[PDB]
Design a protein around this ligand. Structure first.
Ligand SMILES: O=P(O)(O)CP(=O)(O)O[C@@H]1[C@@H](OP(=O)(O)O)[C@H](OP(=O)(O)CP(=O)(O)O)[C@H](OP(=O)(O)O)[C@H](OP(=O)(O)O)[C@H]1OP(=O)(O)O
Ligand SMILES: Nc1ncnc2c1ncn2[C@@H]1O[C@H](COP(=O)(O)OP(=O)(O)O)[C@@H](O)[C@H]1O
Ligand SMILES: [Mg+2]
Ligand SMILES: [Mg+2]
Ligand SMILES: [Mg+2]
Ligand SMILES: [Mg+2]
Ligand SMILES: [Mg+2]
Length: 318
C-alpha cells in the first residue's frame, strides 16, 4: 500500500506554480502518492466524501472552509503537516503577537486598540499631532497601525512632524505599487487595530520560509513603506535580494515553525537596531521562482512523511 499525501486548499493555491513544482517532486518518492482535493469537492461535498489520505497538507486562504478541513482531520485522523486549529489564530494579528511574546520571540513594542462595534468613541485612544496613546501606552511617530484581521493588508505608517507628517498607506499590490503617501496625519477612527513602534531597517524586509524547524529559506525585498513603487526585473518579477540567516534568526525560524505548528511557514523579519524582529506570521507559503527551494522543500516533506509513516506501512526507512 502506497502512503497517500492529500493536498487540501483552494485551487489558486493547489494549482499555483510552486505547488505544482513541489508536488511533482514529492511524487518522485517511491512509496508516496499525492492526491490533490478538487476545490468543488472541498466547497460542495461533505467531508465524509473527501478523498482519503494518510498525511494531510491543508491550509487556509481566502474562501477556504477551515471548519470542514478540521472536521475532515477529526474524521480521518491523518498525520497533519500544518496544524489546522492554529490557522484560526493565524487569521488574527492579536493572536499571532500573543504567541510570539509567549515564546520569547522579539517583536515590535505594541498595544491593541479594540473597538466594540456598538460603541465608536467609547475606546481608550488619545491622539496627539506626533503620538498616540493606546490604553495609556505612548507611541511616538513613526508608528505602525495594523488591522487586527491578518487578511487585511491595509497597514498604515504615520510620519512625525519632523519628516513632514502624513502617512504611508500600504495595500495588496496593484500593478506597480504597494503603498501610497497620504497627507492624512490622524489615525483611522473605526475598526480595531494594533499600534506598534516603527523599526528602522535598511529599507528592506526579510521574508522567511520554513520547511520544518531546521530549514528556512530567506530573501529580502524593498519595504512597501519606503515609497511604494514595486521593483521589477526584466522578466517582470519583483526584485529580491539574497539573505543568509544568522544563528539568532535560524532559532527564530525554529521557534515560529514549532510555536505555530506550521511545518511550512512564512513570516517576516525586520533587521533593526542589531536585532531581528518578527512582525507578521502568515503560515503556509512557498518560495516562488527558486528551483533549489522546490528541490529542498519536496525532499524535506517527503522525508517527514516517510519518517512518520513508514513504520506502520512496514516500509524500510533509515
Ligand atoms: O506577484 P503578483 O502580484 O502576481 C501576486 P502577489 O505578489 O501579490 O502575491 C501575494 C503574496 O505577496 P508577496 O509578493 O509574496 O508578498 C502574498 O504573500 P504575503 O502574505 O504578502 C508575504 P509577506 O507578508 O509580504 O512577507 C500571498 O502569497 P502566498 O504567500 O499565500 O503564496 C498572497 O496570497 P493571498 O494572501 O492573496 O492568498 C499573494 O496574492 P495572490 O497570489 O493571491 O494574488
Ligand atoms: N513595526 C514595524 N516597523 C517597520 N515596518 C513595519 C512594521 N510592521 C510592518 N512593517 C512594514 O509593513 C509591511 C506590512 O506589514 P505586515 O505586518 O507584514 O503585514 P501583512 O500581513 O499585510 O504583510 C512589512 O513588510 C514591513 O515592510
Ligand atoms: Mg511516488
Ligand atoms: Mg496566507
Ligand atoms: Mg506581502
Ligand atoms: Mg507581511
Ligand atoms: Mg501577513
Amino acid at each position: 500500500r502506497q502512503i497517500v499525501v492529500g493536498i487540501c486548499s483552494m485551487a489558486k493555491k493547489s494549482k499555483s506554480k510552486p505547488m505544482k513544482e513541489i508536488l511533482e517532486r514529492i511524487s518522485l518518492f517511491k512509496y508516496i502518492t499525492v492526491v490533490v482535493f478538487e476545490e468543488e469537492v472541498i466547497l460542495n461535498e461533505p467531508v465524509e466524501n473527501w478523498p482519503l489520505c494518510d498525511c494531510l497538507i491543508s491550509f487556509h486562504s481566502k474562501g477556504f472552509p477551515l471548519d470542514k478541513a478540521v472536521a475532515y482531520a477529526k474524521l480521518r485522523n491523518p498525520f497533519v503537516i500544518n496544524d489546522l486549529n492554529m490557522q484560526y489564530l493565524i487569521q488574527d494579528r492579536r493572536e499571532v503577537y500573543s504567541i510570539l511574546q509567549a515564546e520569547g520571540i522579539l517583536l515590535p513594542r505594541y498595544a491593541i486598540l479594540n473597538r466594540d462595534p456598538n460603541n465608536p468613541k467609547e475606546c481608550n485612544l488619545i491622539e496627539g499631532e506626533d503620538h498616540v496613546e493606546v490604553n495609556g501606552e505612548v507611541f511616538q511617530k513613526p508608528f505602525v497601525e495594523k488591522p487586527v484581521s491578518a487578511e487585511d493588508h491595509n497597514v498604515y505608517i504615520y510620519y512625525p512632524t519632523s519628516a513632514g507628517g502624513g502617512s504611508q498607506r500600504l495595500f495588496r499590490k496593484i500593478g506597480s505599487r504597494s503603498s501610497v503617501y497620504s497627507p492624512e496625519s490622524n489615525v483611522r477612527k473605526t475598526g480595531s487595530y494594533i499600534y506598534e513602534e516603527f523599526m528602522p531597517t535598511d529599507g528592506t524586509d526579510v521574508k522567511v520560509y520554513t520547511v520544518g524547524p531546521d530549514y528556512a529559506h530567506a530573501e529580502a525585498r524593498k519595504s512597501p513603506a519606503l515609497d511604494g513603487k514595486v521593483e521589477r526585473d526584466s522578466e517582470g518579477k519583483e526584485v529580491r535580494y539574497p539573505v543568509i540567516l544568522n544563528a539568532r534568526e535560524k532559532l527564530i525560524a525554529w521557534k515560529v515553525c514549532l510555536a505555530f505548528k506550521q511545518t511550512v511557514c512564512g513570516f517576516d523579519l525586520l533587521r533593526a537596531n542589531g536585532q531581528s524582529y518578527v512582525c507578521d506570521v502568515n503560515g503556509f507559503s512557498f518560495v516562488k521562482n527558486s528551483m533549489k527551494y522546490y528541490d529542498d522543500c519536496a525532499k524535506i516533506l517527503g522525508n517527514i512523511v516517510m519518517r512518520e509513516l513508514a513504520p506502520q506501512f512496514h516500509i524500510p526507512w533509515s
